[PDB]
Design a protein around this ligand. Structure first.
Ligand SMILES: [Ca+2]
Ligand SMILES: [Mn+2]
Length: 620
């Protein structure tokens, strides 16, 4: 027996419920099976082996197999609380607005019988029949991740509709999908960073068995699924907050928050019960939905070290935080030794290096860290390479140039938290003569160039939905993210508000050429280890201000030179080819003789070329 809802694998008519609640006087279970009344047979037993480990529990008999029952703990005759470990809840304020098409036959809230969110249990639950048994998850350091917000990815915002997009995603050449938070969040309309029930599946995206079908279908196609998960904080609807109230008296929470950038109620990760709950949550998502790992939102917030509103102090090396993250990782890897642990961290290099290295000497992949190159890519594609404020240097895309010994950095040009590159190009892009980065077709070409200087570099990578079709700006600037230091037009939505959904972009041949370029780069990457391996040696000319940029890669199987003109006029770019001989132009289907490692390539602005030292086919 654990806290939460315990089923009997041999008897689908019964459950045992357990609640951690030191300091309480008495507890009842109320619910469908008590007609929401107080019934003595539902007064809970107190198990208190030591005063700091008080659990209330009861075994409930005589339930109907397959039936859903709503319930709450009724604590000290006042507090009605849904189970912290509920996997499904009914929300009286927001469930009325979930369409029947989104969640068929959704059990209605028991209006007037109780108040507040209720938990749902279901003895004899039908078990999804998993089809894929032999799934091999991509090596952590080879991840090419597609960040997806279900709300804005498809108009129907649900798992069953996601399944219809898988051909589109598979063909792009990504090997993992990262879903923005799926765990029960306040309301229906959210990015998902307002979690209420961290082990429940938000019903606005559809039923659990449809998510299972999605994970299984991804697995069938060799694609991993990562869940973005939000454990720094909990909303006031979380039982962590409600059980002892939203004050400093509540030992689970920090009032005030311990660090900058907190939202809702900052959790105390040093609390043993919070550690237990966190471990339970990670274990649940792995076991129940067979996901391949997690992206931990606001992982720098996993600390009791007090840094107030001082970002520099917060970001500095924090031994306690490192202990906590390692302890969490140990538990995850005891469930599944190759699950991905991805941190949205942004700490100082000493800390990030230590978390990256962790476990690599004793059976683990290390943690993966978000590596934000949105600004530098923004400057590069806009054509402001010697900007007075913002670096256009792309050198650190390669992990060793950031002083990391192993490919544990997930680089991205774009994320849900950052401006769209196409917004910045179309709103602000540079121009010279008749060459205008603000023109859509010109801007799309610059995203091909960006991709050639991104997907080709060893180490994991992430892209944000629809960048591959040139999402951003839109018709008149409405595709603009607020809060990124750009003054969006008035027509743009608020930062976390629903964004335009534009699947019609597939009908634009210019936008599909960008998609196909990225897809062809990722098709190459899939079968050529040069683009993926820690063994690859990388040299580059990606410095701030320099329009004629290049990357060389050398590996036992292949050598590659990528050339690009990030300027606004024609230029001869002179890479250092690693060897003389014939080099083959992948996209254009011809070849160049390199009689000196320093050979010039004339390029129009925005153009790139990818050369290999052996013929390996032609882009199709
Ligand atoms: Ca919700
Ligand atoms: Mn925190």
């Amino acid at each position: 027996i654990e806290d939460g809802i315990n089923y009997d694998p041999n008897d689908p008519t019964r459950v045992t419920l357990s609640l951690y609640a030191p300091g309480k006087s008495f507890v009842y279970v109320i619910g469908d099976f008590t007609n929401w009344e107080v019934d003595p047979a539902y007064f809970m037993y107190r198990d208190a082996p030591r005063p700091d480990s008080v659990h209330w529990w009861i075994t409930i008999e005589g339930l109907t197999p397959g039936q859903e029952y709503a319930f709450q703990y009724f604590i000290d005759g006042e507090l009605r609380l849904a189970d912290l470990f509920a996997h499904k809840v009914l929300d009286p304020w927001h469930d009325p607005f979930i369409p029947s098409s989104t969640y068929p036959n959704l059990k209605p809230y028991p209006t007037g019988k109780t108040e507040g969110i209720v938990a749902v249990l279901q003895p004899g639950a039908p078990q999804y029949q998993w089809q894929v048994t032999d799934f091999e998850r991509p090596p952590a350091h080879e991840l090419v991740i597609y960040e997806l917000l279900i709300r804005d990815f498809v108009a129907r915002h649900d798992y069953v509709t996601l399944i219809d997009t898988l051909d589109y995603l598979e063909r792009l050449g990504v090997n993992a999908i990262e879903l923005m938070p799926v765990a029960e969040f306040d309301g229906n309309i959210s990015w998902g960073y307002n979690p209420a029930f961290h082990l429940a599946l938000d019903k606005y995206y559809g039923p659990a068995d449809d998510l299972k079908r999605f994970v299984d279908e991804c697995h069938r196609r060799g694609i991993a699924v990562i869940l973005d998960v939000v454990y720094n904080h909990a909303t006031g609807n979380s039982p962590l907050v409600q059980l002892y109230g939203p004050t400093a008296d509540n030992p689970f929470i920090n009032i005030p928050a311990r660090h900058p950038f907190n939202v809702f109620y900052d959790l105390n990760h040093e609390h043993p019960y919070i550690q237990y709950w966190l471990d339970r949550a990670n274990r649940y998502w792995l076991e129940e939905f067979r996901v391949d790992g997690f992206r931990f939102d606001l992982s720098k917030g996993f600390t009791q070290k007090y840094t107030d509103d001082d970002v520099g102090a917060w970001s500095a090396y924090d031994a306690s935080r490192i202990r906590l993250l390692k302890r969490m990782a140990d538990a995850i890897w005891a469930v599944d030794s190759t699950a991905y642990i991805i941190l949205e961290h942004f700490a100082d290099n000493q800390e990030e290096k230590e978390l990256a290295a962790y476990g690599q000497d004793r059976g683990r992949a290390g943690m993966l860290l978000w590596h934000n190159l949105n600004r530098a890519f923004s400057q590069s594609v806009m054509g402001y390479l010697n900007d007075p404020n913002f670096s256009s240097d792309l050198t650190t895309i390669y992990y060793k140039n950031r002083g990391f010994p192993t490919p544990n950095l997930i680089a991205y040009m774009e994320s849900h938290d950052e401006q769209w590159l196409m917004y910045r190009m179309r709103a602000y892009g540079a121009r010279q003569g008749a060459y205008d980065v603000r023109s859509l077709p010109v801007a799309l070409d610059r995203m091909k160039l960006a991709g050639a200087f991104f997907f080709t570099v060893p180490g994991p990578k992430m892209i944000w939905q629809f960048g591959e079709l040139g999402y951003g700006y839109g018709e008149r600037g409405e595709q603009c993210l607020e809060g990124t230091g750009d003054s969006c037009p008035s027509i743009a939505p608020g930062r976390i508000d629903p964004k335009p959904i534009r699947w019609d972009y597939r009908n634009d041949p210019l936008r599909m050429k960008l998609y196909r370029t990225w897809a062809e780069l990722l098709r190459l990457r899939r079968e050529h280890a040069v683009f993926r391996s820690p063994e690859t040696q990388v040299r580059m000319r990606l410095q701030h201000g320099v329009p004629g940029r290049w990357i060389s890669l050398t590996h036992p199987e292949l050598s590659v030179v990528v050339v690009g003109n990030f300027g606004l006029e024609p230029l001869v770019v002179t890479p250092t080819f690693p060897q003389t001989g014939t080099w083959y132009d992948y996209f254009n289907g011809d070849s160049l003789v390199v009689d000196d490692p320093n050979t010039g390539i004339e390029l129009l602005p925005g153009e790139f070329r990818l050369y290999t030292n052996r013929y390996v086919g032609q882009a199709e």
